[PDB]
Design a protein around this ligand. Structure first.
Ligand SMILES: Cc1ccc2[nH]c3c(O)cc(Br)c(Br)c3c2c1
Ligand SMILES: [Mg+2]
Length: 748
């Protein structure tokens, strides 16, 4: 009851007895805008009088305003305040849907169903609703039996996997720093505990994220634990139904945050966990120092995160590596690479004689060579005098300072990119015990974000977030109504106005050439510069596509109108970034290294060998588009389950819910639209034959029910369920929102 730990934090407090006096009021209020210049700051006014098609209400100041019934945003009766499934609301609109979230969010209730998907508002405070007792409660309990919780929808997916024998997937969407990553960990926590043993394999799967989070997450201005990479986690399942293995796919590692970090941002956690928290023997063994003494860590102006102990986190990272099985040496080799990368950044090239770079001080070069186990003179020549094939001859390129310091970074980014690729490979090798029968995918991705300087990585992220949103639209709006008409159910199509396939096409469109398609052309073009690229973009579709803007104010930028707003991307040096060039003498300098890992990085074809596209190597953009599209096809194979995560504010503060911010997310996520289709449509659908699965209250249910149509109708007829509430079609019976929930509860 109310004393339960679950009533305290998961269900709405029972209201005052004086509140009852108001909850029964016959009054009718309405949300309005005291300032029409701000269409997201509403206030509650009381409808005083109504004409045939108008309302008159008294503002909070007392002034009488007047509005048409068509444009009016009526307030639901306060009996709905706190309701769990928002499709049960009568007056359904942006103001009301947002108020129900203030109510719940103010009671530390962050989860709220709305239709078949789930909403999750980031609390930014540790809410004790993920303990073991919780997981035990939702084990078996139906979605309708329990309150909104990530465990609930994770169980619905699990039960839908067994009942229907179909693969599932939990698709979690949201803005940057909205709770995507945290909810995934909880989803993994639930599934593992529910379909585990009585375990090792289950313990191992849990310990994967701490590893990846150490090398994969970092501090952005939007989020102090930001996934700079995207991951799709399949939970393989046995024929019986228990977990048999797992597999992790990784995408878009922001591998240049290594060599550079924006002001107030931070490099990947793994580097700071080492310096602060490394053994005194490793410290001098790897020639380590303080964060402020390394050129790749002292530039951001920030080496410390609020309420985070890198020394303690360093413990956790290597605790997890032991559990999955990284050798005592394999771990030391990793730290060996990290130190080596830190030293590389401290190499200070200088114009010795003018013709090219000259490296006077070699203390940093050798400290990096010592760890990597490479001949420091081979590395020095491969960084500054690499060799190339001029025709068929062999020529050494006496690179200058700016061109030598870049090849340095090209190496650094290559190492870590491959290092990261190796970690996941070492993890999948121990988790892919077998190609299993069923599988549940979990999609944690780097989230839509807008920084002061937007670059290629941001485009590919937002392109992903955009592609993901349209997927939400296709299965909630387009495919849902096609099922109705596919069953001849007398449905009139509804255009909810949510479609971003235009912005997608602009980016990845092949014919006509999309943005990425031109970059590929310009990239291979030898004389292609940034001048030629940006001009080849404006001239192409400046005034030919409404999702594109050539700014009057910058010759190096272009705007794209995403589903979450317009992002002005900076084009500087995208050509090299899409080529991802790594000078070849560098690749040899390390292919002959004296370290196991470093050797496996540049000699294992799966990690070093970049695919080839006929004449030229495959580009980044071309590669990722193939990676993403491959993932999207895999998703279409499974029944999805959406979790729309929402960030309450842009300051990472708890109990500070900003109206303007939240509505922009709801407004563009289709949350409001997403309920209408659930409310005005028929969410639940089941084959007519599969419904008999026989309640011994005037029973006339033959298992082998010839003419299933009449067989099920008789049950519904006796059940005395409103026939309007359940229109049925050719092959399956369709139920309106919750109509089936009240039907299946009879058995229980
Ligand atoms: C793996 C990859 C591929 C292309 C990229 N383009 C970037 C950019 O323009 C800025 C930053 Br920071 C990064 Br990381 C990338 C990147 C990474
Ligand atoms: Mg994340």
């Amino acid at each position: 009851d109310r004393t339960s730990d679950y009533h305290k934090y998961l269900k709405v407090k029972q209201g005052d007895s004086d509140l009852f006096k108001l909850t029964v009021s016959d009054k009718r209020y309405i949300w309005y805008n005291p300032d029409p210049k701000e269409r997201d700051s509403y206030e509650c006014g009381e409808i005083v009088s109504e004409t045939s098609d108008s309302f008159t209400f008294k503002t909070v100041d007392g002034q009488d305003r007047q509005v048409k019934k068509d444009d009016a945003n009526q307030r639901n009766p306060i009996k709905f305040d706190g309701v769990e499934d928002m499709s049960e609301l009568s007056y359904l609109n942006e103001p009301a849907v947002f108020h129900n979230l203030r109510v719940r969010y103010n009671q530390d209730l962050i989860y709220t169903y709305s239709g078949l998907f789930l909403v999750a508002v980031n609390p930014f405070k540790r809410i004790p609703i993920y303990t073991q007792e919780m997981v035990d409660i939702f084990k078996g309990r139906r979605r309708n039996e329990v309150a909104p919780h990530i465990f609930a929808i994770s169980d619905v997916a699990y039960r839908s996997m067994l009942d229907d024998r179909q693969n599932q997937s939990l698709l979690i969407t949201g803005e940057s720093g909205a709770g995507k990553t945290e909810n995934t960990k909880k989803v993994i926590q639930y599934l593992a505990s529910v379909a585990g043993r009585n375990g090792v394999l289950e313990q191992q799967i849990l310990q994967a994220n701490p590893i990846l989070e150490a090398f994969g997450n970092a501090k952005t201005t939007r989020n102090n634990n930001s996934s700079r990479f995207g991951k799709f986690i399949e939970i393989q399942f046995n024929s019986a139904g228990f977990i048999s293995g797992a597999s992790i796919q990784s995408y878009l590692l922001e591998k240049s945050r290594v060599v550079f970090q924006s002001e107030t941002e931070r490099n990947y956690h793994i580097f700071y966990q080492l310096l602060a928290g490394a053994t005194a023997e490793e410290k001098k063994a790897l020639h380590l120092a303080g964060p402020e003494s390394f050129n790749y860590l002292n530039q951001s102006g920030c080496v410390d995160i609020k309420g985070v102990s890198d020394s303690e986190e360093f413990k956790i990272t290597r605790q997890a590596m032991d559990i999955v099985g990284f050798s005592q040496e394999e771990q030391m080799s990793i730290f060996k690479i990290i130190a080596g990368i830190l030293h590389l950044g401290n190499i200070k090239f200088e114009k010795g004689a003018g013709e090219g770079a000259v490296l006077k001080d070699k203390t940093a070069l050798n400290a990096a060579s010592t760890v990597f186990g490479v001949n420091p003179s081979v590395l020095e020549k491969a960084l500054m005098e690499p060799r190339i094939l001029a025709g068929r001859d062999l020529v050494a390129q006496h690179l200058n300072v700016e061109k030598s310091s870049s090849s340095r970074d090209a190496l650094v980014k290559a190492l870590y990119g491959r290092l990261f690729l190796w970690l996941v490979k070492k993890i999948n090798n121990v988790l892919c015990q077998e190609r299993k029968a069923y599988f549940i995918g979990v999609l944690d991705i780097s989230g839509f974000e807008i920084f002061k300087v937007n670059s290629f990585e941001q485009l590919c992220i937002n392109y992903t977030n955009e592609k993901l949103q349209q997927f939400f639209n296709h299965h909630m709006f387009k495919l849902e109504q096609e099922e109705y008409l596919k069953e001849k159910i007398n449905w009139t199509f509804i255009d909810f106005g949510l479609d971003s396939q235009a912005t997608i096409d602009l980016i990845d469109g092949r014919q006509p050439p999309g943005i990425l398609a031109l970059l590929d052309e310009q990239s291979v073009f030898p004389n292609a510069t940034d001048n030629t690229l940006i001009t080849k973009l404006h001239s192409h579709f400046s005034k030919k596509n409404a999702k594109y803007e050539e700014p009057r104010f910058s010759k190096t930028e272009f705007g794209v109108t995403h589903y979450a707003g317009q992002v002005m991307y900076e084009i500087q040096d995208w050509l090299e970034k899409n080529k991802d060039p790594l000078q070849q003498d560098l690749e040899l300098c390390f292919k002959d290294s004296s370290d196991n890992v470093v050797t496996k990085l540049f000699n294992d074809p799966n990690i070093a060998s970049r695919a080839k596209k006929g004449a030229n190597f495959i580009t980044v953009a071309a590669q990722y588009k193939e990676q993403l599209a491959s993932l999207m096809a895999t998703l279409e194979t499974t029944n999805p389950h959406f979790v729309r995560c929402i960030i309450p504010n842009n300051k990472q503060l708890p109990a500070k819910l900003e109206d303007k911010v939240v509505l922009d997310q709801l407004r563009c996520n289709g949350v409001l639209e997403g309920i209408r289709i659930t409310r005005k449509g028929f969410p639940n659908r089941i084959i007519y034959a599969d419904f008999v699965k026989y309640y011994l209250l005037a029973p006339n249910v033959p298992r082998d029910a010839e003419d299933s149509q009449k067989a099920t109708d008789a049950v519904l007829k006796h059940l005395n369920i409103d026939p309007e509430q359940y229109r049925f079609g050719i092959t399956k019976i369709f139920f309106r929102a919750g109509q089936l929930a009240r039907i299946e509860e009879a058995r229980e």
